[PDB]
Design a protein around this ligand. Structure first.
Ligand SMILES: Cc1cc(C(=O)C2=C(O)CCCC2=O)cc2c(=O)n(Cc3ccccc3)c(=O)n(C)c12
Ligand SMILES: Cc1cc(C(=O)C2=C(O)CCCC2=O)cc2c(=O)n(Cc3ccccc3)c(=O)n(C)c12
Ligand SMILES: [Co+2]
Ligand SMILES: [Co+2]
Lengths: 382, 382
C-alpha cells in the first residue's frame, strides 16, 4: 500500500554531509576506500574563512566532508557578511557535534522542488527547525529541520554546480576513481524509541511506512511517494542473549544518530573486489564473512536468480543475499568507518522489480539475520 | 663546535604523536600516503575506554595517532584505575588542542636513559612540567614537559613492545607497505619570538646550537650530544614583500606549534616516485616544482656528487638539492597534511659525513631559498 501522502514534492537523495575534525584526511581516506572522485571544494583557496568542505562523487552519490577552521579567521564577519558557502554551518555546533558523536553524518540532504515551501510545510506539521531557508546566489535554496539526534534533514531546491561558492576541482587533483558505486539507496537512523521517532518524521514529511516482507532491533522504513527516498529507523531490543548493536551504537554515539548508509552498486562484485583489495592499504574493512554453510544453503533459495558461478562469487567476496516477494537483494557491511562502533556502510545491488527499477526492490535483508543464525549453528553443529 | 652539554643522556627520536579527531581515518590516510605499516594499537578492542591510538612504523620512524572517545565510556574511572595506555592523555586537553590547532603534533618523543631523571633535571633547569613521570607495567617510564605552544617534549625510557597496553596488530590487517622512509631526521617548531624559545629549550635540555653553513624566517637548530636529535625553531621576518609562511602558520595554528617533520629516506627517488603515484588517490601532495633553470644550474654546484642522470631524476620528481661544507642534502616538501596551512612533511636524504653518518650532514637547505629565488627570476627573465 502506497498512499502517496508526501506533504511536498520530493525528488531524490542529493548528498550526505559528514562533520569532521579534519575534512582533508577523512575525504582522502573515503575517496580511496570507496572509489569516489574529488569533485568540488569550498575552503580557504575559494575564500571560505569559516569551514573547509570537500565533495566526493561516484555516479549520483555525493559525500560532503566539512570541518571548521579557527573561528579567529572569520571573527569580524556576521551572517550577512559570511564567507561560509553553507550558511547553516556553525563553529560551535560543529565542534559540539564532533565532541559528542565523533565522525558521523550531520545532514541527510534530499532535493525538493521548493526548499522554502518544504521547510514551511514541515515546520507547520511538527518539524523542529534547524536552519531557516536561505537563497544562495539567487540560484539554490537550502533549509534544515531536525531528523533525529543531531542529524538534520536538509532540503535543497534548484531554480535551474553543487552549491554556489564551491569550485570544480582541477583535473590534476581529480583522479577518476570508480569502483561501481552509483547512488544512495537508503540512510538508517538509530533511536532509543522507534514509536515517537516514526511519528515525528512521518508527521512532518508525509512519508509512508514501507512494508517489510529477533536479533537486537525493531525497525520501520519511511518512504517518499515514489519510494526513492528511503529512511529506515531502528530501536534496540533489550534483555536479549547478545547485546543489541543498536544499544551499543546509542552508547558510543551519545544517543540517536545515523547508523548506516547503503550505497547502490551497478556491479557489486566489482565494487567488492576493488574495496577489498584496498582494505589494508587505507580503505575499509568488512564484517566477518558468513560460514560456507550459508553459501551451501543459497542455491536452495536464490538458485533461480544466481548461477552457481555467481553464488560462488558471492562466497569469495562475503556477499549476503536475501529474497523478497518482488526482488532479490545483494548486500554486505563494512566495519565502522571511524574510531567509534557507530556509523558503517552497506554496499547493495538489487535485482528485479522492473517497470527503471522500483524502490526497495528486495527489501533490506531482514531475513539474512535468521539465515545467518541458522547457518552459523549448522556450521558449528558439524 | 660541539660542547656536548646535554643535561641528561638522550638517545634518539622515539615517536611523534598526532592528536586527531578521528585517529582511524588519519592513520589510514597517512599509512597509504607515506608507506607506513600498521604496527600496534590501543583502543576499545584492547580495553582502552579512554582513547583510540594507532601506531604506524616505517623503519625506525614511529607515527602515533590518538583521538578521544566519549568521556562517558570512562566516567567511573580515576587516574589510579584508568584504562588509558598513555596516562598523560586528557579528554579536555585533547579536544582543546584540536579545536585550537586542528590536526597536528602534540608530542615529540625522545628516548632517554631515565625518563624520571630527565624530567627532574629538565624541571630543575626551567622546563614547565606537563605530565609527571609514570612507570608503566614496571617496564617503561614516560614524562612530558612543555616544548613550545601546546607541543610537549616526551621522555621515554625502557628498563629492558611500543608501550605496555598496546597490542601488535594482526598481520592480515598489517600490510607491509614501504616506500623507503626510515627515521625522523628533525622536527621543526614555529614560534613568534625565536630568542625566548631557544633560551627556554636549550636551558632545560643542554642542547647546543647547531651551526648553519632573507625569505620570511630566522631560525636556529638545537642538537643533542651526538646531534641525532635535531630541533630547529623558526620565527617570522615581518615587513617583507611576501608574507612570511611562519606568520601564516602562527595565524592559522592559533600560535606556536610544530611546523614540519623531516623524514629520512634510504632512497629518496623511490620514496618520491611512490608518494607521487598516490598524491591524487588518497596520499600527499607536494609543493610546486622549481623551474627547470634550477636544474640547469645544479650541474654547476653538485655535478661532482650527482650524475647527469640523477640530476635529471631530481628534475622529474621535483627534488631540491643543497650543499654544505661537509655534505649534500636532497629534500622536498609536501603541501600541508590537513585542512589548515600549518604542518607539512619534508622528505630528505643526506650524502657525506661518514665516520655511520654524522647528524645534520648537509644542513637543512637554507641555501635553497636564495637558489629558488634566483632560478625563478632567471626562468621568468627569459
Ligand atoms: C541483514 C542485515 C541488514 C541490515 C539492514 O540494512 C537493515 C535492517 O536490518 C533494518 C531495516 C533497515 C536496514 O537497512 C543491517 C545489517 C547489519 O547492520 N549488520 C551489521 C552488524 C553490526 C554489528 C552487530 C551485528 C550486525 C549485519 O550483520 N546484518 C546481517 C545486517
Ligand atoms: C629550503 C627549505 C628549507 C626548509 C627547512 O627545512 C628548514 C629551514 O629552512 C629553517 C631551518 C630548519 C629547517 O629544517 C623548509 C622549506 C620549506 O618549508 N618550504 C616550504 C614553503 C611553504 C610555504 C611557503 C614557502 C615555502 C620551502 O619551500 N623550502 C624551499 C624550504
Ligand atoms: Co540497510
Ligand atoms: Co627541514
Amino acid at each position: 500500500k502506497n498512499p502517496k501522502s508526501d506533504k511536498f514534492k520530493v525528488k531524490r537523495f542529493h548528498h550526505i554531509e559528514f562533520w569532521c575534525g579534519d575534512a582533508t584526511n577523512v575525504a582522502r581516506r573515503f575517496s580511496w576506500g570507496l572509489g569516489m572522485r574529488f569533485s568540488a571544494k569550498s575552503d580557504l583557496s575559494t575564500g571560505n574563512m569559516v569551514h573547509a568542505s570537500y565533495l566526493l562523487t561516484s555516479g549520483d552519490l555525493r559525500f560532503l566532508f566539512t570541518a571548521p577552521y579557527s573561528p579567529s579567521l572569520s571573527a569580524g564577519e556576521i551572517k550577512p557578511t559570511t564567507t561560509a558557502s553553507i550558511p547553516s554551518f556553525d563553529h560551535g555546533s560543529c565542534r559540539s557535534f564532533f565532541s559528542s558523536h565523533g565522525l558521523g553524518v550531520r545532514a541527510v540532504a534530499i532535493e525538493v522542488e521548493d526548499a522554502e515551501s518544504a521547510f514551511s510545510i514541515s515546520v507547520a506539521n511538527g518539524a523542529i527547525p534547524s536552519s531557516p531557508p536561505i537563497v544562495l546566489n539567487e540560484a539554490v535554496t537550502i533549509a534544515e529541520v531536525k531528523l533525529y539526534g543531531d542529524v538534520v534533514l536538509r532540503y535543497v531546491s534548484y531554480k535551474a554546480e553543487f552549491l554556489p561558492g564551491f569550485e570544480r576541482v582541477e583535473d590534476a587533483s581529480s583522479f577518476p576513481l570508480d569502483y561501481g558505486i552509483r547512488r544512495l539507496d537508503h540512510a538508517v537512523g538509530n533511536v532509543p524509541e522507534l514509536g515517537p521517532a516514526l511519528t515525528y518524521v512521518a508527521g512532518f514529511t508525509g512519508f509512508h511506512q514501507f512494508a517489510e516482507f529477533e536479533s537486537g532491533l525493531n525497525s520501520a522504513v519511511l518512504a517518499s511517494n515514489d519510494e526513492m527516498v528511503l529512511l529506515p529507523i531502528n530501536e534496540p531490543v533489550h534483555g536479549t542473549k547478545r547485546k543489541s548493536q543498536i544499544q551499543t551504537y546509542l552508547e558510543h554515539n551519545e544517543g540517536a544518530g545515523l547508523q548506516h548508509l547503503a550505497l547502490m552498486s551497478e556491479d557489486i562484485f566489482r565494487t567488492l573486489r576493488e574495496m577489498r583489495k584496498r582494505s589494508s592499504i587505507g580503505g575499509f574493512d568488512f564484517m566477518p564473512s558468513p560460514p560456507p554453510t550459508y553459501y551451501q544453503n543459497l542455491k536452495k533459495r536464490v538458485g533461480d536468480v544466481l548461477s552457481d558461478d555467481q553464488i560462488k562469487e558471492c562466497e569469495e567476496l562475503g556477499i549476503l543475499v536475501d529474497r523478497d516477494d518482488q526482488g532479490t537483494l545483494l548486500q554486505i557491511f563494512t566495519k565502522p568507518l571511524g574510531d567509534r562502533p557507530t556509523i558503517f556502510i552497506e554496499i547493495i545491488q538489487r535485482v528485479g522489480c522492473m517497470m527503471y527499477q522500483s524502490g526497495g526492490c528486495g527489501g533490506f535483508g531482514k531475513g539474512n539475520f535468521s539465515e545467518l543464525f541458522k547457518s552459523i549453528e549448522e556450521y558449528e553443529k558439524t
